[PDB]
């Protein structure tokens, strides 16, 4: 999602937390948005079924 790596334990094992907040926030945004999209699609399929 635009960070330096996609594995969270890497970012915790490389950077200090006061600047690792920057990377982790980007990951939170990306994963939360993807999860929301999945749930909306499952809602529409539920209405059809």
């Amino acid at each position: 999602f635009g960070a330096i790596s996609s594995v969270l334990n890497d970012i915790l094992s490389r950077l200090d937390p006061p600047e690792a907040e920057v990377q982790i926030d980007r990951l939170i945004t990306g994963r939360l948005q993807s999860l929301q999209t999945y749930v909306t699609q499952q809602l529409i399929r539920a209405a059809e079924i």
Partner: protein, 48 residues
């Protein structure tokens, strides 16, 4: 025009080019053994 509960004034004297290290969030010598500021610091640093 803001109002504060209590003000804390800290004073000391260091070597001149380590005033980069007095800023919060980074490490060094002074930030590791003598004086460390937390990451959510709310105030000012004056040096001359």
């Amino acid at each position: 025009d803001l109002c504060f509960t209590n003000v804390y004034a800290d004073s000391f004297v260091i070597r001149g080019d380590e005033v980069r290290q007095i800023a919060p969030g980074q490490t060094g010598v002074i930030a590791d053994y003598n004086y460390k500021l937390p990451d959510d610091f709310t105030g000012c640093v004056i040096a001359w």
